[PDB]
């Protein structure tokens, strides 16, 4: 199926949350940005999950941000979904 959610990886560790919000906001309207962290140090893991308002924007994120050079790195972007099951 289609997805309004994308994975954004290979992000330089020094990139901040404000910075990644801005980049994704340039592509399209962002509903939520989930940046991943190492909880012990508070440091960025260099990847995030972004929910966009609609399917066109997420697709635009994948088309434009996959291979996009940010800092000294090339970003990886693709569609994301997940299940949730309890134990
Ligand atoms: Mg990564």
UniProtKB/Swiss-Prot annotation:
Residues 4-82 form the RRM domain. It comes from the Eukaryota. It is found in: Nucleus. Present with 6350 molecules/cell in log phase SD medium. Component of the CFIA complex, which is composed of RNA14, RNA15, PCF11 and CLP1. Interacts directly with RNA14. Interacts with polyadenylate-binding protein PAB1. RNA-binding component of the cleavage factor IA (CFIA) complex, which is involved in the endonucleolytic cleavage during polyadenylation-dependent pre-mRNA 3'-end formation and cooperates with the cleavage factor NAB4/CFIB and the cleavage and polyadenylation factor (CPF) complex. Binds to A-rich RNA sequence elements. This is mRNA 3'-end-processing protein RNA15. The gene is RNA15. The chain holds residues 16 to 101 of 296 of the full protein.
